From Swiss-Prot, chain D:
Free-text biotechnology note from the record: Co-administration of salinamide and rifampicin or salinamide and myxopyronin suppresses the emergence of resistance to both antibiotics.
Portion of the parent chain present: 1308 to 1357 of 1407
Similarity field: Belongs to the RNA polymerase beta' chain family.
UniProt protein name: DNA-directed RNA polymerase subunit beta'
Provenance organism: Escherichia coli (strain K12)
Post-translational modification: Acetylated on several lysine residues in the presence of glucose.
UniProtKB/Swiss-Prot annotation, chain E:
Shown part of the complete sequence: 1 to 75 of 91
Gene Ontology terms for molecular function: bacterial-type RNA polymerase core enzyme binding; DNA binding; DNA-directed RNA polymerase activity
Keyword Transcription: yes
Organism (species): Escherichia coli (strain K12)
GO BP: bacterial-type flagellum assembly; bacterial-type flagellum-dependent cell motility; cell motility; cellular response to cell envelope stress; DNA-templated transcription initiation; intracellular iron ion homeostasis; nitrate assimilation; protein-containing complex assembly
UniProt protein name: DNA-directed RNA polymerase subunit omega
Domain of life: Bacteria
Swiss-Prot record, chain F:
Disulphide bridges: none
Subunit details: The RNAP catalytic core consists of 2 alpha, 1 beta, 1 beta' and 1 omega subunit. When a sigma factor is associated with the core the holoenzyme is formed, which can initiate transcription. The rRNA transcription and antitermination complex (rrnTAC) consists of RNAP, NusA, NusB, NusE (rpsJ), NusG, SubB, ribosomal protein S4, DNA and precursor rRNA; S4 is more flexible than other subunits. In pull-down experiments interacts with CedA.
First and last residues shown, out of full length: 151 to 199 of 1342
Protein name: DNA-directed RNA polymerase subunit beta
Functional summary from the UniProt entry: DNA-dependent RNA polymerase (RNAP) catalyzes the transcription of DNA into RNA using the four ribonucleoside triphosphates as substrates.
Family to which this protein belongs: Belongs to the RNA polymerase beta chain family.
Species name: Escherichia coli (strain K12)
Amino acid sequence: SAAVKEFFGSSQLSQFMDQNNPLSEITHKRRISALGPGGLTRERAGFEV
Amino acid sequence: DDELPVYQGETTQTLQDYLMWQVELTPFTDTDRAIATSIVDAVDDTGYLTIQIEDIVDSIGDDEIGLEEVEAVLKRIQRFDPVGVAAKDLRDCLLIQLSQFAKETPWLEEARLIISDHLDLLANHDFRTLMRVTRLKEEVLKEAVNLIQSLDXXXXXXXXXXXXXXXXXXXXXXXXXXXXXXXXXXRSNLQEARWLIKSLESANDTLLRVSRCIVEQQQAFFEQGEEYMKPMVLADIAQAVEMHESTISRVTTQKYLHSPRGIXXXXXXXXXXXXXXXXASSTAIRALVKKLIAAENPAKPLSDSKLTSMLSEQGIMVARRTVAKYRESLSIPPSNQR
Amino acid sequence: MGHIELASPTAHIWFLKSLPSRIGLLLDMPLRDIERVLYFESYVVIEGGMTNLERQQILTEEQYLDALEEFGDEFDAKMGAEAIQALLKSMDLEQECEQLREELNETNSETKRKKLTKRIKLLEAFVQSGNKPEWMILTVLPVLPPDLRPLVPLDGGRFATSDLNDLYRRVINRNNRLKRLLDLAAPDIIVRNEKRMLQEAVDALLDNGRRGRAITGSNKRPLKSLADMIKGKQGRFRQNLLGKRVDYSGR
Amino acid sequence: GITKASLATESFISAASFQETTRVLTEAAVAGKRDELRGLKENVIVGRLI
Amino acid sequence: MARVTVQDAVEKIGNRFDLVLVAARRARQMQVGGKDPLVPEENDKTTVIALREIEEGLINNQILDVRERQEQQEQ
Amino acid sequence: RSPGVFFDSDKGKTHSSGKVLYNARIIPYRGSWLDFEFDPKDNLFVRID
Amino acid sequence: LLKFLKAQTKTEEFDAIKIALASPDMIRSWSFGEVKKPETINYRTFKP
Amino acid sequence: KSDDVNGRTKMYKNIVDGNHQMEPGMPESFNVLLKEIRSLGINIELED
DNA sequence: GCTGGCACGACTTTTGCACTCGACTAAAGGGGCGCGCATGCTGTTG
DNA sequence: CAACAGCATGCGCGCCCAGGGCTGATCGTGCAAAAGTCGTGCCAGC
């Protein structure tokens, strides 16, 4: 339990939803991020990605 | 470090801080500012108490500087933001708070000066004979007293105690069959330091087991359902796990157990053995003593000896002194009204 | 302020690992030499004339057993930082600087003509300055005033320890344990490891860099130290230096 | 060459606050140098007119 | 009489940095106390009063020095 | 970045002479990484993590 | 006997901030007395 | 108007009174720095 | 003569140095870059 | 076969946020000198 609710609770890839606009909702829920746990620490990524 | 919201501080303002801010901005002389700074520290979070005056005067170390100089300055300080500030005795507090009624208050000014200045000591109980003293009658005096009762006391408006200081509990006592059951709620160098963590992680799991354990033995030592708590000695908890008394009292002193009644964790292990064959230690003695003294004295019996006889009738072997002394304490009106 | 008394004087990593190393180039030793022999490792033979061994040299522990076997006494080698204090204490500035300038006069290659000038301008600075070189490795460690280490009070009460406090707690634990084992008259191995551990501790309280990992099991991060404590951006940018946040302002 | 030339300033207070603080303060602590307060950053950091 | 431009008072004393010193030393007098304005007040603050008196040529470093020596000699 | 076998030229922006330095990293879903590289002197090397 | 001035004790006018090594003796000149124990504030008393 | 504590007070009291004069002092944060460098074995002191 | 408050005693509570050795198997990160300075191994000059 | 000069590899600067997050607990181990408080008795007020 602490691992699962740790993930969904707090995590770079679980964020509060953009709730102004429908279209804000939508575009939040189809978004592809390069950041997080799996990679791309940023400032060090470089200009090619 | 910086660039983050480290808990650097807030710099809040208390009452003495604010009073001193108010002194900074008023036309005091070099000396009068020293008397003012001398008084504002004497003030308390409660307002009214400016403690002893003649120690304020004598604290300056003579050399002239009479009483009247501290008296005037004192009045002006008493006049700053929270209306009545400091002064003494509450009487002069209500005279300073009553100093500004705008003077356009009907019936209130005079009557209020008489009641508040003098004879206010007899206004505690009720009007009665005071009605004959000031010749007032009916609601003329009652409306003035409505104003006097409408004043409030001192400061405690500055406050600056937003911190409620909550308990946070420690171990939860889930109530079972008319009792309680514990659950306890709520490169190579630093790698060797990692190992210490393994021991700390192993002790962290047993930390709840100590709370549930000592909590279970504590539930077995004292009956929950019974009035107050059954008398126990630290020798019982020291008998169970064979731990030292001071250690157990330290764990119960630091952490606080949350049961359904009481937040009250180290008070559940402290009791007396009474040293008597006929018999809940001092807990039910003082508790039930104040409870028996709660309903009593149809008018003004004020008899602690009768309460001592009632305690002796229960089989507790009262000394008529100890029982009366412990019973009359903690704001108890007993023996005071006689 | 405050102060804490250290059993075995250690570290001060601020010197020595700030390149170049003043302790290294002052004593004519490589920083791998002194860095290696500060904690544990070599015994750093000091003084000890009338033998095979020279004044500033090191050796392996097996070579020390062979040394005490053949030479016995008249070889004095202190394994902890006390040999750097001893060597460092025995350094005579005037004569060494003078003979080094003289030696510089007849030199040829520009390589050896540079280092030497570095040592002249350094040691000379210690002479005209009036500092004793001994002071570099420190004995009494001063502690920072309480209010500028505040305690980071919590949501429910029950204050939690700040970042800089942990370093002081740690150093104090190792200082008391090294003192306890030192007054116990115990083997040189375990008190040795305590000397090592305490130089690690003080060097970790002055800079969490210098070597690797540092941090904690708190979620880690390097923590911060008194070096890191220097004004946000490690310049005095923040807080001071053109950067006060300010009053009667709005936006 | 302008960073070399900053760090090499006579006043040990500026140039400490430019770049390298450890280095700076170690040269200065060993040497025993005095600031004199003669430039604009020092005056700022001490809080005096420039 | 709000002053948009100080140039007229800058021709009187070169280097405005000097003007600011003299302006404020003269304005301080009227501000805190122990002086009255040499020029009719237009309701303006004391700072503009001072700059006007500098633009009129009634006040300057030398003039304030002579007034200082006169006030010290009269006291 | 997906798991499997990857190759890189480094674009010979290191040695200042210029070359083609071909390094191959293997990327698992979870586990260690193996990355074979070329030397300026043209020798293969193994890196692990 | 009073007229007590904390604000007036430091008007100190200086030039040239100076810097150097700190001897253990000068350290002890700064020292208010020694901190011998690691713990900070008792969790009961809420006093240091 | 940021870290001079005595000088912020004097400032605001003179403003309320119509003085508009500064009476500048020494900003806190410098003092702090001097303690934090004293916390390494370096003294930095201000010499008159 | 009775009740209440306080003083004296016992107890039992509060308070002060000084140590205690234990140990285990992971937890991961992770697509900049320049720039420079020093140490070290190689190489060529005599 | 000698010291001397050069090429190269490694390490430490910079830029820059980045977000919190937390942790509180714990644990004991004796014995011993000093003190807070409950009990009991004595003295004063009504």
